[PDB]
């Protein structure tokens, strides 16, 4: 039924949700795939064509949501060749009834006849719309007797069916009969063939599977299912003006309606068996090929750092070698400015390994990799290592506050003589698989020196450990979690809780002194002519 | 404004055979796209018209299957597949699309009875109650004849009476498809008493010989 | 059950104003979508749409007769009124009123129709005479008997048998206009011969224009 | 030969051009191809290793151009496994001699012995360099008697040999003999085996095919027969300290030195297999995928412009449809901001076709494509069109001021009612191939009305026509052309800058030409073409100053200006430069 508009034709269609442009077409074009069309939501454009007749025998309605030259819903011009003697001679618009918005323009079609005969005011609604029909067809045949002067062609079957519809007062202006019994529904654009939503020729707003409706089936509804906002399973999306259950062609559902691609601040997600645009949140996913192995870069240096801006996945590994940090005079790569390392604060996943053998001495924490959540380890370093932290004598805390999974590989943390807080760390939580002979943690600042100088996990960190001092560096919280901060209370009584996480409660959850304020967050959890 | 014209001005069909009636209009009956309010009505003898078909091709609730309707613009056709005995009457076409609603002139559909039926004849003498008034009306009755073609001759004392009789004919019966006819002879009381033998002679196809029913003035 | 009744004078003098009243039941002209129409039929001629009134008080008329027609409504009385001025003998016809309910069809439910005759002449009631066979003219099995409705002017006259119980075999003939200017008809019926003594056969004629009801026995001439 | 750094251990070479790092290596590793290494230019790092002996017998020099922890050219740390017994114990440094700069750090080698036994001040040249040697073994055998108390190991062939190379004060350092006549070349790093730059063990600056040199062979050299710098036959480039003919694997030349990638404002050019970083000249080429058939874009729209910034090529086509210009409410693409069209002002070449069916109404020319010079027509549009301009009613001139070649396809220019200046265009100059049934130009502003209204090519344009009004829009100039603008004459015989003419284009005279009032200041670019020289005269050339220290094939070239301001050779035995021709006025 539906088809986005502009040689063959995927136009065995009835409505073109767009413009119909016919340009630079020769005489030998199968324009028969258009016969079925009977609504054009944009304009119709016919220019630079050599074919003799334009078959659109079923077209009745041209909406003109978009108009050509800001004036015309139909535009027909220069459809002739002088050398060839091929030219347009007829517009087969026998059945054309209503041009909702826009005018008509037919000029400079040397062999096109009879366009001057018809009455355009019977069709165009906007009477202030411009209508130009000139300089297209002299030495033209006169019209048939049966047509009585109004025709889309020489024959007697090519007459404009100009049948006056004197609708009744009660009828708001569109009717399928003469008396007040036969008023078209209010949602009908033009007339109708009956008094229902289904009987309209064209819809004033939206078409839901034949029924002309004011709004496509909305996403949330007070369906009384809970007497509140519910997911009417019967939900539909706008393909411009036709309600569809599933966006056809190759579209995506951005909120209420179909679109050709998600907007800038959103991304595609596989949801409800459909592709939906969900808001990007922090930042849209951006993968960026990594270093080492199949990469052309053996380390990150002053040439690669700016290639990792706004990256969420690394699609590979990350290497921080002293040749990249301090520069390379045999390659003439300059040294790296430590601030640029902040580029990695957006990284949440690394497909292969992470290798750190050098780091700016002032940086006492790899907190630039705080939001790292997963190290895949599908590519590995040295003797099968997914995480390697070596020879860092100015670092004092790991700082991987958001690391939760190392999908595969071995772990090596050795010779970071000033590093603490890693002793108490349940790696069995983070590393996937048996931690058997897979940990190589040696020669960091000994436990005793760390505890003596005060370097220990915050009391609210659970036995899982921590990635540094403070409550925000814990692996797991002993009691409850106020965001990234392990928190000791939860404000439940004197703020609800779920899965040992402290959250705020929905509006209208009456604050109650000494008792539960929320029992959960929501309209259904909080503890129109109303009272 | 709109002139309606039915084409078979009269129609005679054997039961079981088809029928076609046509309604041609002076202007197109198209009000709006897909809206042509052509209707076909049937008026049976001495009844109100019934609606048979609306919107050219849609049978109204109860109309049997044999009634069909086709047409567009200025030309439309009603079709009876198997004409039955109940279908006799006058068929009217009607337009409801334009301001002056208009009917067709009408189409008389008659029945062509398969077998021939003979007129059963009865004679009725003037009542004494009427003869008191001063006029005498004799009534000859021909009953249930199919070939409507029938003739009666009045005779008083074997004298053929001219200009003294009037006839009345029923409409075709929608069950038997038969007709009935009453001939009435009107005389002055004196002229009635002047003669004595009153007879009506019926000449009908189904009758091999002229049936004559008669009476004499004083018989009881 | 939607039923409509047309009422009005059976006789109207020329150039006077006829006033017909369609009373109905089974519906109301206040419901959205309802309309009542008036259609006349001259005797032996074709139907002619006259006027239509709707729940909107919206009125439509035949063009040729627009000036003379006036249609009115009263939902409280379930009644529709039509008024026609300058009555001419040509206007002599049977006037039906009709219901228009569905927008896809018109004229679904019809009334029986009241008969209006336009003439300067005066109403006359019929003379009813019994038509029995002569007992010597013994046809055979079937016996015919009837009534002769003789001198009445306004045309509507109805003849029934046994107050409506006898309907099979009845033939009420079309009225013929006599030279006198008055109509005359005969209503006959054929019955089994020996049960002319088991059942009593009487005819009921009503000439409402002259307010004339008559029931006459058609007993035998047997002597 | 020479290997690169740690990684781009099978290094069968002599010098390591970088740092030698041995980390997380097993005891069973094969470290024997490293025994032919003799020089390490960076530092030596050895950590987390399990092997028992570090075999570096032939290593003699560690330059320390890069030093570990910014303080040490040698770093040995944590080469022991506490749970295991496989650890390090020995550094097989038999022939180590000199560490040029940087210190030493040997700590936490639980089984490494005899590193407190060796005098590092013999080796380390930097007296202020930091030396740390601590916590390397807890119970180790004493040193062998032969070694006298200084050893790299336990054996008597493992002794630190302390230098006996005595030198006279003249050698000012190292020598291959005790007498003043036996001094090492000034370019020798450390000692030598003879007085030449070939005899050095290590070079103080660079290494040209075995010769210690201060600079690699420069790319230009002074020819005395032409009195000018000409390309050097055996020019060589700087791979760190090795002067090479062809830069090493996966490298490019910047100016004199081998680099891995071109700098930002430079671009790679083949240059006969020798990859050169030549100036990008303002904008660096940036090819970009096109629109149309074979692409994911049916037109340029508000979601496309952003992907065309700084593009020089188009690798395809460019389509401008009304749906892209005015937006598409059915895909809910917004309309395009006309200013953003200026993105195409960098486009120099379009590989396929140009299709323009809608254009902003106020923009009366396709000046946004002013810098477009070539339409390839590899891909074509509709009936084989390479250039299509259609239905644009507010354009009055094309504006393709730089277009000079439509390589293939047909041209179609039609329905641009307000368009002029295209009537006179000699498309034979632009369209490659015969102009017959390949040009479809019709129903634009009729030529009579353009002529009457005065929209015609500027008088200074040639018969080839123009892309619009003025002298800048010409296809070719009737007389001369300065900076792509037609002009009546160059600035010969008057004006600034003084110019000459080449192929009908004006070019400024070389600086150091003296503006001649009344006569051609110069008959070409270059200093040998000036009528009169501004400052001095070296041979046939006008120069700002005479060659002083410019390098020829035989040596540095010094010349002096004479009283007539002509550069004349200087005295052979002149110390550096001169101010005259004799040994007296020398210097
Ligand atoms: C190609 O087409 C261009 C237009 O599409 C031509 O540019 C036009 O050049 C005239 C002068 O010859 C400018 O005239 C002035 O217009 C301003 C109005 O403001 C606008 O223009 C100024 C820049 O001139 C700009 O800063 C503003 O933002 C506006 O866009 C008047 O105030 C002046 O009095 C004067 O009339 C046109 O403005 C300028 N149009 C544009 C869009 O730049 C161009 O000359 C054509 N080239 C060829 C070779 O024919
Ligand atoms: C469109 O093309 C023109 C012509 O190629 C571009 O203009 C030219 O740009 C170069 C620099 O890329 C100009 O030359 C340079 O000028 C600077 C400043 O004086 C000088 O330091 C350089 O040594 C060099 O001479 C050149 O003069 C200029 N063209 C003219 C006639 O002035 C223009 O940039 C291009 N526009 C784009 C790509 O958007
Ligand atoms: C990571 O290390 C940096 C220093 O390298 C810490 O920055 C300083 O932290 C203290 C708080 O402990 C502040 O008072 C200073 O102002 C910070 N900056 C400077 C320049 O002194 C930083 O807090 C460390 N982060 C973590 C999570 O340990
Ligand atoms: C609405 O869509 C249905 C399904 O394609 C179609 O049959 C119907 O004609 C459309 N409505 C109108 C007014 O065309
Ligand atoms: C990265 O995201 C930030 C924040 O949204 C933005 O300011 C910046 O322009 C983005 N960088 C790129 C290259 O898109
Ligand atoms: C990284 O974590 C910090 C924690 O405070 C947060 O503020 C920041 O937004 C995170 N970056 C992301 C999610 O890209
Ligand atoms: C960094 O490390 C070096 C070497 O271990 C040490 O000398 C220096 O004090 C440290 N500086 C900082 C700021 O950590
Ligand atoms: C570490 O975490 C894992 C997660 O499954 C758990 O099974 C294990 O008991 C934890 N060990 C300690 C010592 O907390
Ligand atoms: C310079 O390189 C050559 C390459 O063959 C080598 O023989 C020579 O010893 C090198 N000189 C040095 C490293 O001083
Ligand atoms: C484009 O070129 C300009 C000017 O050379 C430069 O400033 C800019 O960084 C380049 N890149 C982008 C994305 O604009
Ligand atoms: C475009 O051309 C038309 C016709 O000459 C003119 O009326 C209109 O002002 C022009 N628009 C612009 C923006 O120049
Ligand atoms: C047009 O260009 C061709 C070269 O392709 C040249 O031979 C011809 O002379 C030119 N014509 C004019 C009028 O300049
Ligand atoms: C240009 O000037 C040079 C130097 O005076 C001269 O040698 C050369 O012949 C001149 N070019 C000519 C005459 O074409
Ligand atoms: C330079 O000195 C040598 C040796 O005394 C001498 O032979 C030569 O002539 C001198 N140079 C000149 C230009 O005289």
Residue numbers in the entry:
A (entry chain C): 8 to 13, 31 to 518, 523 to 555, 583 to 586
B (entry chain E): 1 to 220
C (entry chain J): 221 to 443
D (entry chain A): 8 to 15, 33 to 611
Direct quotes from the study:
The ErbB protein family, a subset of receptor tyrosine kinases (RTKs), includes four members: EGFR (ErbB1/HER1), HER2 (ErbB2), HER3 (ErbB3), and HER4 (ErbB4). The activation of the ErbB family relies on the binding of extracellular ligands, which promote receptor dimerization and the activation of intracellular kinase domains. Unlike other family members, HER3 can only signal when it forms a heterodimer with other ErbB receptors due to its functionally inactive tyrosine kinase domain in the cytoplasmic portion. Background/Objectives: The ErbB protein family plays a critical role in the progression of various solid tumors, and HER3 has been implicated in resistance mechanisms to multiple cancer therapies due to its ability to form heterodimers with other ErbB receptors, thereby activating pathways that promote tumor growth and survival. This study aimed to generate and characterize humanized monoclonal antibodies against HER3 to inhibit its function and evaluate their potential as therapeutic agents.
The crystallographic analysis was performed using the Fab fragment derived from the TK-hu A3-H1L1 variant, selected based on its superior binding and biophysical properties. In the asymmetric unit, there are 4 complex molecules represented by 12 chains: chains A, B, C, and D correspond to HER3 molecules, chains E to H correspond to the light chain and chains I to L correspond to the heavy chain of TK-hu A3 Fab. We chose to study the complex formed by the B, F and I chains because it had lower B-factor values in the interaction region. Only chemically plausible contacts were retained and well-oriented polar pairs marginally above the 4.0 Å cutoff were included when supported by geometry and density. This analysis led to important insights: both chains contribute equally to the interaction with the antigen; specifically, the light chain (F chain) interacts with a surface area of 419.3 Å2, while the heavy chain (I chain) interacts with a surface area of 475.9 Å2. The CDRs of both chains interact closely with residues located in the N-terminal region of the HER3 domain II, and examination of the interactions revealed that the HER3 residues at the interface with the TK-hu A3 Fab molecule are: R84, Q119, K172, T185, L186, T187, I190, A192, P193, Q194, C199, F200, G201, P202, N203, P204, N205, Q206, C207, C216, S217, G218, P219, Q220, D223, F225. In addition, residue R84 forms a π-cation interaction with residue Y33/F. Crystallographic studies confirmed the importance of certain residues for interaction (C199, F200, G201, P202, N203, N205, Q206). Taken together, these results suggest that the epitope consists of residues R84, K172, A192, P193, Q194, C199, F200, G201, P202, N203, N205, Q206, C216, S217, P219, D223, and the interaction region falls at the N-terminus region of domain II of HER3.
